[PDB]
Design a protein around this nucleic acid. Structure first.
Ligand SMILES: [Mg+2]
Ligand SMILES: [Zn+2]
Ligand SMILES: [Zn+2]
Lengths: 397, 1338, 99, 100, 70
DNA sequence: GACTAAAGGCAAAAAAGC
DNA sequence: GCTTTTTTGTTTTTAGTC
């Protein structure tokens, strides 16, 4: 309740206002000591200081980070990042132990798992899946209203401070058919602690079992069985995965794979429903449905898929048309698959056949064995794209 | 090329002798050409030519006149390296004063003159005049003057009035006065003086001047008159494009000062008036000030775009300074870096290398190998030949690889084994294949950690790498006592599976000829790996002097044990491998071998262990699955009971019977009890799962579950992890420290609620953050240990001293933690060891107790043998070999020369990673009761009650061994007596946790010598039900009433103040504040009856850090440093005074004693020499200064050992003690004779001065000093060598101090020798210097 | 990454850094402690004098390797004499008093 | 609102007042694809309409001339792509939220 | 070939003058060298000296005395 | 006579320019 | 990534007071 998130809009407004006042004092002085009626605003006003200030803020700062392109999950968790650093936060040397900790009010607002390790831990924690910002800048999370003993389907958004004087049930608590709890003494949490409360005492219920972990840690299967440290390790190495030339589906997943694949803009999604008319390895032509296309404009959709291009981590991006001729598509349907995805589902690595057994020490402590069969069939071989730039300057000679 | 460094000030004639010419003009280069001026700053005649073997005019062309001068250009035709070294000088018409001594905070000019620096600066920059006997009677030589006073005195005397100006006046005054009469007069002044503020300044001045006269430097030499010029190479001027230059900052100031000199010379060429003479002299003065140290006073840069220039000071110190950033931390070639992997087919002295890295590293050696064979012709030919990677290149590279060890080291080289050597083995790939076992030394897992490979070049480096660096020599860890080649994670489980025994398997119950048969039965699949066979074996024993006698028998064992016994060496008993060989055993295994057969059998045996363990772990198969983790069925039922009782406790709070705190404690306690019960149930279920029938009925035996195999064998995991996997994970605590009241009731195998997981999140985040932030503070600590203990080099073999007291095993209240066996092992005795048999000497003096003399101690029940310690040594800046003890890295005793301080620093710094950041006496054993500090009297019940607060009790075994120790507080009754044989489980003392105060004689209590109501208050409370007597303090009671220190008058039937008969003092005992007396008036009191009742560890890393720094605690426990009978003082505005009354000597002593905190000191306390007064933490300072030097040693070593044992880390006590010998490196002179009166300086220097003085000056008292300590932070600043001091802190100050004092550096350290580039005299360099002095300069 | 002998920085005669531009592995000082803790003095002398920051010894050592030798220069490096000259420049008399 | 913070502009004593009227966003000069290809910011021009009003000197507040400068160029404002990210020169850079 | 110096330690135990005399031996075995006293199997002089410790007639104290012989 | 509290200076650190 | 500038934590000296 005492910490507020500033998004790009607020810093943009602040820098714009700074440049505005900086140019405005000068133009006010010039107008006061200059012409009175025979002058135009355009020549006396200036634009270069404002443009320079805003461009410098956008292109050079400790908070305008460098986008990572090695993985759709990497970019989604980078766009969903919350940082306590930058011009207005706190430094690494003067950061106390207590501001690097999980407060009991992070349940449903900030992921307690995904967090970079090393010098800056607990400062760059990301926010959960259902967390959304408030009008004043506070963090707000969904909940399900319970009137007396029945859960109302209508959602209700709660801020941080408002949660303090309430009692909130748990999603895993069973409901019989219309919210009637199986036990009249249901578990709950009221003020930074957990206890057991009566059925009639509860009034709010959490929406689901997923608003605790972020997107980066919600695709680890069977997360409720492994240690928190190992969960963090898995989340990080899942973030840092590199795409293969031919992604394969995960045999065991979570169901958020489609959401992460389609919400991110890497993959091509059908903007308007219709039927396909001509497929190609580089472009897609879609015959839009007659009843859907508005009158006046009677054209058809064109999707110009991108090809091998240099990325911030030198990995390759190439969309693959995952459709055929003469098959219907819907609005918001997946038409092409980018890197590390297939059929509109996230796919980061490969599903190997593994056995747990010591073997002559070649897997001594953490090392791994690989059969020569997998390197025959190139199941893990990757493609990297490098840029070489040569400039032609002019010296004195 | 040398072995000592002497630094002192320079004389003008010798400065000119350094020079080779005189510079006239600053034109470094002429226009329209590129020839430096023949008479300018860059002068060939002064410095040298810019062309090799050629003169400026080039009439002598590098064939006829090498080394001889040229007629046109007066420079010897030679190489350019002389230009690098040749230097010149500049003669100053007006002498100037050096500025550092002016700018130093301890101003040497001011200290030697006894005037401040403000007036000196004014007379130096020509703002005030200086009198030089202007008048014989009016004023003196050491007064300042002004222009108006000068004119007034000029008219006054004129003829005798002389007063010069500036630096020439300063140096004239400095030279015209002597220093002898000054030194004697100052010695007499300090001899008869009273003040202390000026006493320190006067002592500093007299020391400075007595060193100055001894230094041989004349004071007037400090005021320089000729300035040397740096050789031109240090101020390069590269010609940039269009005739431009780099604009060296040195050349700018050189031009400025030379222009000032030329202008002054022109000014004095026509006898200019003094009005403009002063201005020019002043300008030259700031010119030389700027050149000598720019920006210190006036910041007169005037030569840049508003930025300072580097004149001299910027290139002495600073990070941009080259000293500790260019000889401490730097780049290096002939190295590579890459990821690691596991090569489980290599020997201990082998590491893999990728072919590409191998060829890249060894290409310079390839060319030499190639050109020798004649395949190539030129370097280009060899390079293009190896570029194609032909056939011969691989075989010649494999030839040169065979004998050329390479050094591997991880990035964080925490301790001595960070850098190891190996013989390379060429393989394909791009990873450093490493031996598994050695990876325990590096502490390097295989999750992507990188290592770097280096390569020695010379024969010296390679030979020393083979001798020392190689892993086969560094078997034993230098830390405490144990090998680093203990079998690692995977192999241990393989060996554990090798040696087990089921109750029934294929091929059991028969017999085999020997271990060879067991191999064939198992390999052919006819018998199980573990069975119950009876095999016949033959082994050997070392009973004879090197002769292995053989014996054979029929030892019942299992099949696998014979397979294991196949690979063990000759001389080991078979009893070692009968038990189920876990993890700690195998290490002990190796230890046994290391102490019977040597080194090569041990290393080959360890290699065989690794191979067999890997092979039979692969062949066995050990997987983990859901069916392998069994959940105890009772566990669920258990929670119900807990839940039920939890609800019960809730009802207790519901009715108000219990409050919040006690309910919380009860619920957490019952939950912990439930956790204990479920953990025990799960352990019982796992341990005995297996039930296999053997010919009918079913029999139970140890389970073969994989999880239990991992847990029991010690390969990985422990009881905690297995408990978490199946049983309760355990109740977690909030990060602030509070423990939550709802424990997690589910294990990892079962599901976890979202709250339970969320609650368990921040429990691990705190630990992860602590580990992440611990890599800086802990490692930094090692630095503060390296600098203080940098040298500590063993120099000579034996000194002959025999000091040291009471090296005994430590008892910590309960059972003994470590015996005498490991505490004294590795040390050499000094006193003769007396067997407890009335002079039947067992171990002679001056013998190394390795194992055999240790083997002679357990049967004699010896418990107190003192050995010679490092602190009790009296050498010169070193330690004796026969005093440090046996070296821990190798089996034999310490060698000669090798460093110990760095070893100790690294050994104490390594366990930092495993070091975290944030009423009655019960007997447990059987033996006799003994009491130390025997001071007790018979009580009213006939038992014993003590009157001395510092009494301690110890249980003694029937053989005289001490097995228990218990501090006995004041007023504690005794339930037994000394010498009574009492077993365990019987209390012997009882005391209240209020402290009662008890009398000593029988009789009535005539309550006199107190004021009723004022001192004693009739507190007729309803609880006690009587008018109690409360002796309130001065603040609690009336100030006037509390003005007599009331004492109860215990009387006999006569009603008189009966005394302790004739000996000490009457029965009047001064009752302290709040002396709660339940007696009313005149109640009969027997001897030993109560009188009244007084109503009376941080984290490991901070504890170590502030213990080594010797920081004073919050409340230092005051101590009585004098004997006699203690008394009570008076009362003041603050802490009450407390006077002591020793029975002899200088008795009138008192001190400032706080009264709010507890003071367990009374009038009737016959205190002794070195007994504590108050309670609480004690700083090492008082302990060192009052109760002996050995007392501080026994304190901090015990504290740090307790900390490390709490952290589960054990280290040897030699490492902790040696830095102590370096920590106590200073002393304070009490009696004069060597220093002046109180010069706190090196204790070793004073001791060696006194020892030689007594030989010649027999009778002189010398100096009865007191050896005082100093924190490591302060100890690093007081280094004897000035190079180490100048390395990092205040380089300008220490350089000036060494220059004026004529300091001589013998180069006794290691960092200082690294600084100057000479070979370090710690390792093989020490033997080089000793052999260097023996042959040459003998 | 691996490096034997390549280019050097202009300001200081040290090998380059990083994997690119044919850099050299960094040699800190904790391993200086770890290596002086052994009996190692010759290796320390080599790898702080001739391997890293020398120019006369560096070129000579390379030429002294190819011709079948592995012999160093058993004397004080010129990197120490210059320091001496520095101390001799200010006002100070510094000398190798004992030889 | 950012404009409205410094919306009034008033001279020293010349009775000159500069005020904001309206603004419009220009179309981006180059699309995102060529911005990555060429190396330019996918930005938009800023156009504003400024009104300068002048009163008679040493007279009450009566307007004389209204100078309406429309579409005044106030530099370039970088634009967010449809995927929720910004490109500065050739590489996409996203600005993350800050917790203060 | 030879990797350990246990034979040197057990009778001539010292790690410093031993390597110094081994270096003195090897330096003039390399340049101006003569035939060794033991058979060679593709080794350089950086390991031949240590093997000469095993034969007994070459040892750390022997070289110091042998310095007078030269 | 010694303790308390004030500033100058010294050294390490984040930031910005090259 | 290398190097200089300004800023803040640690150290030291001196005027005022119990
Ligand atoms: Mg690895
Ligand atoms: Zn000439
Ligand atoms: Zn000694």
């Amino acid at each position: 309740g005492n910490r507020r998130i500033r998004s790009v809009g607020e810093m943009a407004e602040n820098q714009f206002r700074v440049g505005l006042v900086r140019v405005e004092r000068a133009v006010k002085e010039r107008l006061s000591l200059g012409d009175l009626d025979t002058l135009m605003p355009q020549d006396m006003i200036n634009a270069k200081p404002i443009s320079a200030a805003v461009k410098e803020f956008f292109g050079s700062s400790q908070l305008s980070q460098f986008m990572d392109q090695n993985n759709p999950l990497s970019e989604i968790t980078h766009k969903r990042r919350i940082s306590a650093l930058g011009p207005g936060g706190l430094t690494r040397e003067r950061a106390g132990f207590e501001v690097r900790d999980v407060h009991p009010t992070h349940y449903g607002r900030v992921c307690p798992i995904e967090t970079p390790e090393g010098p800056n831990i607990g400062l760059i924690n990301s926010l959960s899946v259902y967390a959304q910002t408030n009008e004043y800048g506070f963090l707000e999370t969904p909940y399900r209203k319970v009137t007396d003993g029945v859960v109302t389907d209508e959602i209700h958004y709660l801020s941080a401070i408002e949660e303090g004087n309430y009692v909130i049930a748990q999603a895993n608590s069973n409901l019989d058919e219309e919210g009637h709890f199986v036990e009249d003494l249901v578990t709950c949490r009221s003020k930074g602690e957990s206890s057991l409360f009566s059925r009639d005492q509860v009034d709010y219920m959490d929406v689901s079992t997923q608003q605790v972990v972020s997107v980066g840690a919600s695709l680890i299967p069977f997360l409720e069985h492994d240690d928190a440290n190992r969960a963090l390790m898995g989340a990080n190495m899942q973030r840092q995965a590199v795409p293969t030339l031919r992604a394969d589906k995960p045999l065991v997943g979570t169901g958020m794979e489609r959401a992460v694949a389609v919400d991110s803009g890497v993959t091509a999604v059908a903007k308007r429903g219709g039927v396909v008319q001509y497929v190609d390895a580089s472009r897609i032509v879609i015959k839009v449905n007659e009843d859907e296309m508005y009158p006046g404009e009677a054209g058809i959709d064109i999707y110009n898929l991108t090809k091998y291009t240099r990325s911030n981590q030198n990995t390759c991006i190439n969309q693959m048309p995952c459709v055929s001729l003469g098959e219907p598509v819907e609005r918001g349907d997946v038409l092409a698959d980018g890197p590390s995805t297939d059929l509109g589902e996230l796919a980061l690595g490969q599903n190997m056949r593994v056995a747990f057994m010591p073997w002559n020490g070649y897997n001594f402590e953490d090392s791994i064995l690989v059969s020569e069969r997998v390197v025959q069939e190139d199941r893990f071989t990757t493609i990297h794209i490098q840029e070489l730039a040569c400039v032609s300057r002019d010296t004195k000679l | 090329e040398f072995d000592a460094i002497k630094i002192a000030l320079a004389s003008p004639d010798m400065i000119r002798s350094w020079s080779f010419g005189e510079v006239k003009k600053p034109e470094t280069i002429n226009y329209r050409t590129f020839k430096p001026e023949r008479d300018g700053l860059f002068c060939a005649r002064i410095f040298g030519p810019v062309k090799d073997y050629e003169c400026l005019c080039g009439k002598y062309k590098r064939l006829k006149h090498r080394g001889v001068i040229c007629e046109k250009c007066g420079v010897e035709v030679t190489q350019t390296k002389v230009r690098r070294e040749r230097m010149g000088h500049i003669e100053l018409a007006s002498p100037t004063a050096h500025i550092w001594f002016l700018k130093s905070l301890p101003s040497r000019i001011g200290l030697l003159l006894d005037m401040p620096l403000r007036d000196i600066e004014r007379v130096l920059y020509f703002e005030s005049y200086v009198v030089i006997e202007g008048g014989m009677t009016n004023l003196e030589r050491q007064q300042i003057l002004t222009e108006e006073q000068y004119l007034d005195a000029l008219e006054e005397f004129g003829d005798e009035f002389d007063a010069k100006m500036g630096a020439e006046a300063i140096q004239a005054l400095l030279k015209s006065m002597d220093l002898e009469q000054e030194c004697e007069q100052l010695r007499e002044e300090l001899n008869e003086t009273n003040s202390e503020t000026k006493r320190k300044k006067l002592t500093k001045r007299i020391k400075l001047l007595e060193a100055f006269v001894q230094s041989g430097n004349k004071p007037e030499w400090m005021i320089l008159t000729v300035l040397p010029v740096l050789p031109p190479d240090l101020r390069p001027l590269v010609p940039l494009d269009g005739g431009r230059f780099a604009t060296s900052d040195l050349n700018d100031l050189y031009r400025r000062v030379i222009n000032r000199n030329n202008r002054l010379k022109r000014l004095l060429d026509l006898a200019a008036p003094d009005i403009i003479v002063r201005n020019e002299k002043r300008m030259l003065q700031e010119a030389v000030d700027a050149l000598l140290d720019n920006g210190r006073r006036g910041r007169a840069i005037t030569g840049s775009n508003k930025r300072p220039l580097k004149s001299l000071a910027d290139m002495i110190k600073g990070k941009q300074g080259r000293f500790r950033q260019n000889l401490l931390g730097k780049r290096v070639d002939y190295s590579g870096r890459s990821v690691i992997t596991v090569g489980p087919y290599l020997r201990l002295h082998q590491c893999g290398l990728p072919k590409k890295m191998a060829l890249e590293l060894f290409k310079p050696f390839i060319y030499g190998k190639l050109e020798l064979r004649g395949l190539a012709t030129t370097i280009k030919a060899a390079k293009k030949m190896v570029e194609r990677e032909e056939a011969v290149v691989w075989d010649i590279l494999d030839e040169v690889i065979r004998e050329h060890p390479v050094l591997l080291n991880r990035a964080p080289t925490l301790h001595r084994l960070g850098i190891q050597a190996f013989e390379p083995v060429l393989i394909e790939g791009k990873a450093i294949q490493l031996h598994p076992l050695v990876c325990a030394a590096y502490n390097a897992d295989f999750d992507g950690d990188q290592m770097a490979v280096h390569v020695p070049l010379t024969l010296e480096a390679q030979l020393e790498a083979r001798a020392l660096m190689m892993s086969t020599n560094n078997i034993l860890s230098p830390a405490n006592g144990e090998p680093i080649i203990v079998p690692s994670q995977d192999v241990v489980l393989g060996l554990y599976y090798m040696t087990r025994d089921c109750v029934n398997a294929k091929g059991e119950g028969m017999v085999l000829t020997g271990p060879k048969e067991a191999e064939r039965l198992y390999r052919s699949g006819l018998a199980s790996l573990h069975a119950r066979v009876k095999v016949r074996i033959t082994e050997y024993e070392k009973d004879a002097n090197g002769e292995l006698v053989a014996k054979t028998s029929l030892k019942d064992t299992t099949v696998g044990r014979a397979i294991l016994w196949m690979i063990v060496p000759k001389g080991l008993p078979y009893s070692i491998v009968n038990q189920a060989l876990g993890k700690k055993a195998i290490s002990k295994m190796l230890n046994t071998c290391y102490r019977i057969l040597g080194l090569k059998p041990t290393v080959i045996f360890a290699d065989q262990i690794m191979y067999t363990g890997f092979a039979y772990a692969a062949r066995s198969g050990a997987s983990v699955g859901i069916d392998d983790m069994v959940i105890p069925e009772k566990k669920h039922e258990i929670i119900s009971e807990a839940e039920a009782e939890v609800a019960e406790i809730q009802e207790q709070f519901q009715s108000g019977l219990v409050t919040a705190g006690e309910r919380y404690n009860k619920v957490i306690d019952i939950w912990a009890a439930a956790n204990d019960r479920v953990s025990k149930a799960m352990m019982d279920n796992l341990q005995t799962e297996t039930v296999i029938n053997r010919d009918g009925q079913e029999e139970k035996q140890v389970s073969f579950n994989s999880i239990y195999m991992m847990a029991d064998s010690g390969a990985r995991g422990s009881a905690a992890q297995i408990r978490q996997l199946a049983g309760m994970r355990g109740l977690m605590a909030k990060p602030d420290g509070s423990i939550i009241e709802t424990p997690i009731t589910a294990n990892f195998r079962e599901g976890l609620n979202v709250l339970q997981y969320f609650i368990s999140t921040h429990g691990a985040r705190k630990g992860l953050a602590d580990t992440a932030l611990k890599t800086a503070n802990s490692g930094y600590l090692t630095r503060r240990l390296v600098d203080v203990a940098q040298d500590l080099v063993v120099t000579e073999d034996d000194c002959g001293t025999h000091e040291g007291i009471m090296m005994t095993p430590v008892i910590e209240g309960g059972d003994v933690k470590e015996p005498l066996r490991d505490r004294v092992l590795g040390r050499v005795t000094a006193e003769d060891v007396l067997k407890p048999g009335t002079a039947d000497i067992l171990v002679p003096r001056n013998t190394l107790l390795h194992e055999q003399w240790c083997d002679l101690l357990e049967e004699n029940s010896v418990d107190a043998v003192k050995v010679r310690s490092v602190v009790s040594c009296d050498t010169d800046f070193g330690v004796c070999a026969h005093c440090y003890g046996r070296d821990l890295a190798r089996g034999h005793i310490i060698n000669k020369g090798e460093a110990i301080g760095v070893i100790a620093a690294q050994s104490i710094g390594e366990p930092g990673t495993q070091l975290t950041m944030r009423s009655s006496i019960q007997v447990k054993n059987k033996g006799s009761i003994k009491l130390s500090n025997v001071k007790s009297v018979v009580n009213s019940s006939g038992k014993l009650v003590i009157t001395s607060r510092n009494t301690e009790l110890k249980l003694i075994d029937e053989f005289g061994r001490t097995k228990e120790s218990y501090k006995v507080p004041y007023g504690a009754v005794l339930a037994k007596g000394d010498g009574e044989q009492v077993a365990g489980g019987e209390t012997v003392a009882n005391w209240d946790p209020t402290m009662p105060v008890i009398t000593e004689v029988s009789g009535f209590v005539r309550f006199t010598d107190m004021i009723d109501g004022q001192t004693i208050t009739r507190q007729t409370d309803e609880l006690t039900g009587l008018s109690s007597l409360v002796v309130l303090d001065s603040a609690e009671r009336t100030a006037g009433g509390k003005d007599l220190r009331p004492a109860l008058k215990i009387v006999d039937a006569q009603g008189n103040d009966v005394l302790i008969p004739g000996t000490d003092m009457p029965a009047q005992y001064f009752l302290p504040g709040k002396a709660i007396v339940q007696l009313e008036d005149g109640v009969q009191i027997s001897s030993g009856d109560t009188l009244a009742r007084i109503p009376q560890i941080t984290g490991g890393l901070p504890r170590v850090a502030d213990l080594f720094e010797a920081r004073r605690p919050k409340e230092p426990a005051i101590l009585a440093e004098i004997s006699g009978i203690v008394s009570f003082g008076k009362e003041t505005k603050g802490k009450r005074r407390l006077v002591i009354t020793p029975v002899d000597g200088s008795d009138p002593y008192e001190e400032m004693i706080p009264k709010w905190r507890q003071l367990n000191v009374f009038e009737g306390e016959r205190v002794e020499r070195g007994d504590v007064i108050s309670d609480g933490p004690e700083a090492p300072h008082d302990i060192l200064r009052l109760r002996g030097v050995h007392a501080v040693t026994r304190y901090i070593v015990n504290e740090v050992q307790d900390v490390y044992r709490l952290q589960g880390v054990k280290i040897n006590d030699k490492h902790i003690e040696v830095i102590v010998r370096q920590m106590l490196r200073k002393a304070t002179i009490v009696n004069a004779g060597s220093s002046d009166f109180l010069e706190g300086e090196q204790v070793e220097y004073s001791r060696v001065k006194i020892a030689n003085r007594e030989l010649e000056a027999n009778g002189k008292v010398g100096a009865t000093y007191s050896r005082d300590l100093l924190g490591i932070t302060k100890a690093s600043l007081a280094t004897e060598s000035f190079i180490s001091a100048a390395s990092f802190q205040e380089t300008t100050r220490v350089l000036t101090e060494a220059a004026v004092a004529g300091k001589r550096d013998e180069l006794r350290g290691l960092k200082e020798n690294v600084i100057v580039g000479r070979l370090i005299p710690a390792g093989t360099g020490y033997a080089y210097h000793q052999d260097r002095m023996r042959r040459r300069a003998a | 990454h691996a490096r034997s002998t390549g280019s050097y920085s202009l300001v200081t005669q040290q090998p380059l850094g990083g994997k690119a531009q044919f850099g050299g592995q960094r040699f800190g000082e904790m391993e200086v402690w770890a290596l002086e803790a052994y009996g190692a003095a010759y290796t320390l002398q080599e790898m702080l004098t001739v391997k890293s920051d020398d120019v006369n010894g560096r070129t000579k050592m390379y030429k002294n390797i190819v011709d079948g030798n592995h012999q160093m220069e058993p004397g004080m490096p010129e990197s120490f004499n210059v320091l001496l000259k520095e101390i001799r420049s200010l006002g100070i008399n510094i000398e190798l008093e004992d030889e | 609102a950012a404009f409205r913070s410094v919306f009034p502009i008033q001279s020293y004593s010349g009775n000159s007042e500069l005020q904001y009227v309206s603004y419009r966003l220009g179309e981006p000069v180059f699309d995102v694809q060529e911005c990555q290809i060429r190396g330019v910011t996918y930005s938009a021009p800023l156009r504003v309409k400024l009104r300068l009003v002048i009163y008679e000197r040493e007279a009450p507040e009566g307007t004389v001339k209204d100078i309406k400068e429309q579409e005044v160029y106030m530099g370039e404002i970088p634009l967010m792509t449809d995927n929720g990210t910004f490109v500065i020169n050739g590489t996409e850079r996203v600005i993350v939220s800050q917790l203060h | 070939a030879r990797v350990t110096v246990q034979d040197a330690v057990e009778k001539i135990g010292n790690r410093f003058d031993l390597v110094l005399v081994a270096a003195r031996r090897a330096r003039q075995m390399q340049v101006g060298g003569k035939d060794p006293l033991v058979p060679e199997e593709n080794d350089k002089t950086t390991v031949i000296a240590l093997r000469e410790i095993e034969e007994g007639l070459i040892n750390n104290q022997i070289l110091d005395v042998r310095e007078r012989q030269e």
